């Protein structure tokens, strides 16, 4: 009796369920959307207690067979709060680290950007947008200078990567806040349920992307409330024209 339970984003939990049909055991895995990278070990009712990095090597009769990676690379469920971004700010996501890197943006005066490490097809999850969880009230009350990295999650929650966590030397557990804006983007923000970060958003490709291509997303600020930083207002004029 092996069960696979998929999230709408393509990640899954897999293992033998307990008596009560819960994902509880010492041999449960979260499998990322590549259907190959996994976090394997102790879960309780689908929550990751101790997941070790693994590669899904094959399935036999539906049952996944994993090989553990070397290192003592372990992860656990660690949802951010209003004040804490991560228990391990410097521990990278292992799926994201194989797919993207941060470098100088090709967009003029845009600072750093996020780039593809390898060629990927359409609909590929590339990066995760984790951050602290604050209210729309807090965000909407403060200056644009403090709102460079704020991403609406839902009606009650905004995800932010505030200073000094906007620098990779201080935070690199996720890198989605590094993707720059484009009115002609190659990626979108999409909902994602992550075993370490909880419910967040990810960056997903719209189309095939080449290695070393800059990943961009449409930030989606209200154009007719435009409520936006000045650099975006400028770019909006150019795009429309």
């Amino acid at each position: 009796g092996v069960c696979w339970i998929y999230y709408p984003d393509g990640g899954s939990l897999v293992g033998e369920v307990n008596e009560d049909g819960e994902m509880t055991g010492e041999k449960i895995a979260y499998v990322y959307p590549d259907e190959r990278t996994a976090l394997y070990g102790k879960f309780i009712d689908g929550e990751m207690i101790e997941g070790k990095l693994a590669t899904l090597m094959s399935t036999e009769e539906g049952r996944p067979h994993f090989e553990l990676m070397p290192g003592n690379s372990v992860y656990h469920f660690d949802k951010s709060t209003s004040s804490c971004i991560s228990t391990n700010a410097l521990l990278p996501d292992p799926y994201e680290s194989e797919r993207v890197y941060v470098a100088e943006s090709l967009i003029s005066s845009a600072g750093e950007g996020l780039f593809s490490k390898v060629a990927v097809g359409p609909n590929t999850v590339m990066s995760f947008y984790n951050g602290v969880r604050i209210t729309h009230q807090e965000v909407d009350s403060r200056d644009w200078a403090l709102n460079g990295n704020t991403l609406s999650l839902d009606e009650e929650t905004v995800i932010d990567v505030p200073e000094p966590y906007n620098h990779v030397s201080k935070y690199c557990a996720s890198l989605g806040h590094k993707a720059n804006h484009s009115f002609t983007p190659n990626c979108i923000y999409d909902m994602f349920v992550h075993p370490r970060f909880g419910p967040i958003k990810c960056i997903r490709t719209l189309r095939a992307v080449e290695a070393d291509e800059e990943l961009t997303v449409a930030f989606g600020y209200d154009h007719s409330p435009p409520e936006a930083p000045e650099w975006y207002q400028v770019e909006l004029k150019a795009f429309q024209a």
């Binding site: 965000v139 909407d140 403060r142 704020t150 609406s152 209200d222």
Partner: peptide
């Protein structure tokens, strides 16, 4: 409104 993707 002072956030992305609302």
């Amino acid at each position: 409104s002072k956030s992305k993707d609302r």
